[PDB]
Design a binder for this molecule. Structure first.
Ligand SMILES: CCCCCCCCCCCCCCCC(=O)O
Ligand SMILES: CCCCCCCCCCCCCCCC(=O)O
Ligand SMILES: *C(=O)CCCCCCCCCCCCC
Ligand SMILES: *C(=O)CCCCCCCCCCCCC
Ligand SMILES: *C(=O)CCCCCCCCCCCCC
Lengths: 267, 288, 68, 235, 288, 235, 68, 235, 68, 37
């Protein structure tokens, strides 16, 4: 009647707005919109900080590039937003924090391009390490890349330097980087950016954890995994490239246990 | 006095309704999986169907029924040697976990989080080892739960076996397997099958060694140990025994489904090992 | 303090003055104060799979185009 | 004491039993639940979720991301199959490691309707019509469109609705089928054919992939719990 | 609270009525068996009778009562040898069936189809075999049901005995025989005692080998296997054991009566063997 | 715990017991019954069906189709028997393998009335009268019509109703008889004689067969379940 | 949730203020949720044998000629 | 006897069980209670009582009366700590042997708010302001007033009310913490600093002690009973 | 002479037509005349800690100066 | 026949009440442990 459509959306949070004209509806993970911590589930007793529009707004991370050789990308939350404006400051000044998110993945191309990205949001996205001599050895620094994220690989390559081990993840793409088959990742909240259909993915994520609130600096609640289910192609070019951009807004974030700021060892 | 007993697990699934030919703008068959949704079709959406009164139910695949079984989670070895042995009498210490074996672990790991009461059942077997004709009298075993912080036994007969506060089971050989229940004892609101994090934040102002910890590990799952001994004094003929521990998660709830483990387990985390990463076998695309 | 519940009978014996038909019940009495000691009742509930099969913000009408 | 008489079964440990037992931690102060998103009540809820099929298990594609991609091209019409698969959801290698297949491998028996949904991943400028078919068992498995077209089938027109679902209606002699390859409870044949051909304009990729997904319908159930052959522990 | 309890199995049969002399066109005695019917006569139709209040009943020949007995359907052998043996520790694998023995099989085969719950009882016996004086401690046995599709154990101690999902019974030697019940588990609406058909249709366009299958066989009756082991570790004195399995069909219904097996059984089908086809003995026509 | 005291019988396994026991497959989704034709509720229903008697167990006829045929002919009247059989339904070789006999061999005791029906299989042109007799035990077994005629009997006139039934009324000292040959519970004598003779016109077979059938009446019962000697398993 | 039923008494003791006469009942309580676990009640039904003894389309009247 | 069937657990002795058992002295004439002052109903009542902290466990002060005395002096203002303690009430050596700590060592888990009260024991003529701080975990432990002042804190003015209480509010990720040193359930940092300085007039002691006390609040609880490492019996 | 009491349920099974919800009770019957033979009921009382935490003669009002 | 069943040991501890900023003569934090309380 007025022409409203699944494909055309506007999202506004704080001082930020996203528009899209080629959406494929949007997902609310497990049917649960983000929410503040109810009194009946509360646990730290101090009055929480709730930054509201100062932190619940769209932050855009560094753009990456999709090519025919890309195996996939991953980020962790809250880690990818640790250095984002007042969200990052509130996270590091407090022992505890909780937050939900709107995740908007952006990737446009043309009616002559093809390819499809699976965009998965995974609760507790534990990834496999690079070692066959020690388990659970990925270091804090390598497990937490911040906004640059990390990547998947098509080949497991064990680290053989036992003198100074690399201590990083070696996440194999068809094993979802965690020992399970990628074809089943669709039981996690997801969308697919299939270039002939849509140019974005939107996932609204509730805070998920076995606790009401926890250490954001120690623990990532959600992982975002983006993998090419169908490879990028274009006209008859051998090396096409198109960018992928992530923009994420915290939602209903609240924090407890205020003290001096955490200054983490990140390199 | 007497209590007597909304979709339940044992209810019949929906009937198939009869449906006829169709020609219209309704398009159930066409869909768009990019949205993240699965198309909710039933056969009458794409073929002609008859009426069928459905009697099958999903009673055996409720979470409770999928998990209603004791699974072996460990084998503990103990013995009772002669007093003249150079070797110490063996008592066993086991850090409680479902990750030392693989079958129950894989089933629980279809989910991210769970809550349950735990039933533990203990099967105890014994045998002679030296080709001798000497004999032994019926053994009694002490299975002591030593929760984190309590003194772990260092000798089969030290003071810790007094158990004034730890719970202990004294099991008599040859009787029905021992059994206890434990409540949901997690320090969280649910057990975490996966913890994407660390127990320590490494600080810039501190040495790397001081801020280091294992990926994916936390006391979320430190439940302490079981310590087991043969209570009988040393005997001239050595007897060795095994205690098999079976875990059944009862009164269970689970959250956030996951793809199941597809390559062999490799330690208590999600790590995998080179040479085990090829679960699928060969099959040609156009071969039935 | 007995709980009486009904059984879902699968194979029925040739009997309706004792077994197969006139609803067969069973009895449970809990012997322990701790509910962790209880047996499982298996009287469990089902739910709609939609939070996993249809987690989209705008309702799916299957006869309609998913994208519109 | 009350006169009692022990029956058979006395002192056994049946691992599937369901009895009361004493609590080792009486009066423990249990932590209450919180409302965690994503609770599951029945394993068949997971079976109703679409997961992607590893259709192409050739020696070089199996165990790689390429196993999920079914390649099509704009070649002239042929009546020969794009893919052929057996309806043995727990034991055909292409279905047994999907979420549906991996849950069916914890049960001995399965029953009900299934559905296959295909996603076209070519460019927007590519068009085409395909025929998706299910042939219930007992005859020569379809290797030509002429035979496949005689069974249950959907002719898919590629276009703005990117995907197409074929329902495999429960058609079976037994009330439940086995979750192993078995002739008596065999389920029949799934196949996909070109109905017209893929057509593209110039400056467009002439080859592209489709992805397929399988999920259970609301009439689907399983029974007789059993261990899976999909995990083991050697020594 | 308390429930308290149309021809029943224990009702008295019909009384004999007194009947006198007769002379008429009524002809009960004459009949025609070509019709396929049996002539429904009682004694008062062909002789003079007195009145008799009948008290006998058919209570013990109801289907339930005819079958209300455990019958031996197999004997499984297992052992527990020294660790120094060249021979592997024997665990047993038995494909579940009532056709390895003959008595229950013949009774069930008075009918074409049946439905029942199954009660299985297990009698376990053990003995020494080497004329040695060495001893053994009381054994525990694991009886694991491995349903079709589940991994069958290849060694007495491999991972399959974890039984996370298969049901297992751990039986302790010297205690009351083990016992479980199973529901009607058939994939059909009744168990088929006879299946006149094949599991495969041979197709013209296919090799004969590819379309071949055994006559009368189908997974209608594949119920999987029982796998049994001695759980105790190896002992210096070898002990051998036997598990006898008894099957009682309870809550039973049956359909389509058949002539009973009259010559010796010969395999799991209806085949017979040369030299066994003469069940009747000699008796002269006019000799009482 | 509740004070209890074990009685004799404790821990035994009586194979005829009737106790509850734990289920190895809890919450199994049982397949429902369908209404299959031919349900049986009691073994005596099968005993009431006529089955054919192997009367002639001579060395050359036993274990062949000929054992069921009793040969008659148009020979001159004789008072000598066509057949002689003992009323021992589970143990006389002619009755013990009939359906009635084979069910009685799973029980120790039998009681009630029986009936024998004979079918004439000569040509339509053949006529005749026969005498069918039951003599309760305790006297010389009938070998001549003169004696057989003094007991219970039916004189059968052959004609359009092809068959004739003689009822053996329950006449017994004990309330049940044994299902083995036993003098104390002996049942007496069944015999058939020519009353006039078989007569045929010319161009007609002068010899022909009759077939006999036995079944239980509605007052018939059995008890004390037991194994049969009619099947065995050697080694 | 007890089921009380009567016994068919065969040999009666010399007693009618306790055994033989004033209907002797027995009690059953099911202890398990699965009905396959139940004992057999043996309270079974009989039926007319006609589907096997008289399966003819037109009713048999025994005093009449079977063929007419 | 009543048919019974023994389950698993039969004949075991679980030391935490709770069953009836026969009395060895039946009809004993029990002496009645009298109302003795000081009855206790719950161990947490004892945990709510202030007991004194052995703050200074230096090699020469530990295990002497001096371990309880925290020495202050009228020295010029510094931002450096008077004392530093970890919030690990059952395992930090300064807290584990207080009444609260010794009760927590019979349990595996603790939860709730705590409170620290300090008593000034200098002369009446001495004045001063101190800052008492609690910093929840996850950052550099405070070693300067600048950092300590950013967490929970009380600025204590010394005067006629001799003592001052800082409440350590329950601030925790888990619903209960472990009663051992553990990073995942770490509790944070307690510290005391000079806010201004201690000032005294002439003819007055320039050094003096403060004493500190710890007790549980009314929201405090413990669970999972366990043996303590604080007593043993060697051989 | 049964005592029926309620359990405080911690983990609840997916059930409210048998377990988790509709108050789960348990039953106790004492078998012995001597009360020393009884099990512990664990239905115990709490009290205010004041006789140890505030044993002062004049009432403590926490918002007020303790010394006045 | 059947008997069926004031702060008990298993009762929940007191709730935390919300409380805001304060500036007044009320002095909960100051105290005197000499009193024995
Ligand atoms: C005398 C026997 C005492 C038995 C003590 C049981 C102690 C608690 C064990 C908790 C088991 C936890 C299983 C889930 C673990 C996880 O979080 O991954
Ligand atoms: C731990 C013990 C488990 C026992 C498992 C019993 C498995 C089902 C057996 C079905 C018996 C079928 C008998 C009739 C067979 C037929 O169809 O001919
Ligand atoms: C409800 O519980 C009252 C009905 C009581 C029926 C008999 C109880 C059977 C024995 C239970 C003993 C107590 C168990 C600790
Ligand atoms: C009906 O069941 C109520 C009457 C209860 C009578 C006493 C029950 C005896 C003990 C049964 C225990 C529960 C069995 C699992
Ligand atoms: C109250 O006690 C009356 C209800 C009785 C219920 C059944 C009692 C169960 C058996 C107790 C036996 C006596 C113990 C010495």
């Amino acid at each position: 009647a007025c022409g409203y459509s699944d494909r055309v959306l506007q999202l506004t949070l704080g001082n930020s707005t996203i528009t899209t004209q080629e959406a494929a509806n949007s997902v609310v993970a497990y049917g649960r919109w983000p929410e503040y911590l109810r009194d009946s589930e509360a646990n730290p007793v101090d009055q929480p900080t709730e930054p509201d529009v100062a932190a619940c707004r769209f932050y855009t991370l560094d753009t990456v590039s999709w090519t025919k050789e890309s195996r996939g990308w991953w980020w962790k939350l809250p880690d990818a937003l640790r250095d984002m404006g007042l969200f990052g400051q509130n996270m590091y000044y407090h022992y505890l924090g909780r937050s939900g998110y709107t995740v908007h993945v952006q990737c446009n191309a043309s009616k002559f391009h093809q390819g499809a990205l699976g965009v998965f949001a995974v609760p507790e996205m534990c990834l496999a390490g690079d070692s066959n001599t020690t388990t659970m050895h990925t270091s804090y620094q390598n497990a937490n890349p911040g906004e640059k994220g990390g990547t998947f690989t098509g080949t497991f390559t064990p680290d053989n330097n036992q003198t100074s081990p690399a201590r990083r993840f070696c996440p194999v793409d068809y094993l979802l980087g965690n020992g399970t088959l990628l074809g089943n990742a669709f039981v996690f909240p997801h969308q697919i950016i299939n270039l002939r259909t849509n140019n974005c993915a939107t996932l609204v994520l509730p805070y998920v954890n076995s606790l009401s609130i926890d250490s954001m600096v120690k623990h990532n609640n959600w992982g975002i995994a983006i993998l090419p289910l169908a490879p990028l192609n274009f006209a008859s070019e051998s090396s096409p490239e198109i960018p992928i951009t992530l923009t994420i807004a915290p939602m209903c974030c609240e924090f407890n246990g205020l003290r001096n700021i955490t200054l983490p060892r990140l390199q | 006095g007497s209590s007597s007993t909304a979709a339940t697990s044992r209810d019949a699934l929906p009937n198939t309704e009869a449906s006829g030919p169709t020609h219209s703008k309704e398009i159930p068959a066409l869909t768009a999986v990019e949205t993240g949704a699965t198309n909710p079709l039933v056969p009458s959406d794409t073929v002609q169907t008859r009426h069928v009164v459905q009697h099958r139910s999903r009673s055996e695949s409720s979470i409770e029924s999928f998990f209603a079984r004791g699974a072996c989670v460990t084998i503990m070895t103990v013995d009772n040697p002669a007093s003249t042995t150079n070797k110490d009498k063996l008592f066993a210490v086991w850090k409680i976990t479902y990750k030392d074996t693989v079958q129950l672990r894989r089933k629980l790991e279809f989910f991210t989080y769970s809550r349950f009461d735990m039933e533990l059942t203990f099967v105890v077997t014994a045998n002679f080892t030296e080709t001798n004709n000497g004999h032994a009298l019926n053994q009694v075993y002490q299975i002591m739960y030593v929760p984190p912080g309590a003194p772990v036994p260092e000798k089969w007969d030290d003071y810790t076996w007094q158990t004034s506060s730890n719970p202990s089971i004294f099991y008599t050989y040859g009787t029905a397997p021992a059994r206890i229940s434990v409540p949901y004892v997690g320090i969280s609101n649910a057990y975490s099958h996966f913890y994407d994090g660390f127990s320590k934040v490494p600080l810039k102002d501190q040495s790397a060694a001081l801020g280091d910890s294992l990926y994916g590990a936390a006391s979320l799952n430190d439940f302490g140990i079981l310590a087991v001994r043969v209570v009988n004094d040393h005997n001239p003929t050595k007897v060795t025994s095994k205690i098999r521990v079976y875990l059944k998660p009862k009164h269970i709830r689970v959250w956030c489904p996951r793809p199941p483990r597809a390559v062999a387990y490799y330690g208590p985390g999600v790590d995998y090992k080179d040479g085990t990463l090829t679960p699928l076998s060969t099959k040609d695309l156009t071969t039935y | 303090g007995a709980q009486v519940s009904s059984q879902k009978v699968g194979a029925h014996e040739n009997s309706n003055r004792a077994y197969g038909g006139s609803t067969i019940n069973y009895t449970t009495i809990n012997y322990y104060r701790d509910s962790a000691s209880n047996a499982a009742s298996k009287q469990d509930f089902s739910q709609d799979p939609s939070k996993f099969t249809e987690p989209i913000k705008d309702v799916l009408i299957k006869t309609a185009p998913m994208l519109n | 004491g009350l006169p009692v008489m022990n029956t058979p079964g006395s002192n056994q440990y049946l691992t599937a039993d369901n009895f009361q037992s004493p609590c080792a931690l009486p009066e423990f102060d249990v932590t209450p639940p919180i409302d965690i998103p994503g609770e599951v009540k029945n394993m068949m809820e997971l079976a109703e979720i679409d997961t992607m099929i590893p259709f192409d298990l050739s020696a070089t594609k199996k165990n790689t991301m390429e196993m999920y991609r079914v390649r099509l091209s704009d070649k002239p019409h042929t009546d020969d199959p794009i893919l052929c698969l057996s309806l043995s959801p727990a034991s055909d290698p292409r279905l047994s490691h999907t979420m549906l297949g991996e849950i069916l491998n914890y049960y001995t028996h399965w029953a009900g309707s299934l559905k296959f949904t295909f996603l076209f991943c070519g460019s927007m400028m590519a068009t085409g019509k395909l025929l998706v078919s299910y042939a219930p068992p007992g005859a020569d498995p379809p290797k030509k469109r002429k035979e496949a077209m005689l069974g249950t089938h959907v002719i898919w027109d590629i276009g703005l609705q990117s995907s197409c679902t074929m329902v495999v209606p429960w058609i079976s002699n037994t009330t439940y089928r086995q979750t192993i390859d078995d002739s008596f409870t065999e389920g029949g044949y799934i196949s996909v054919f070109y109905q017209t051909r893929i057509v593209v304009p110039l400056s467009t990729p002439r080859e592209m992939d489709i992805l397929g997904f399988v999920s259970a319908c609301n009439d689907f159930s399983v029974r007789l719990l059993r261990d899976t052959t999909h995990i083991e522990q050697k020594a």
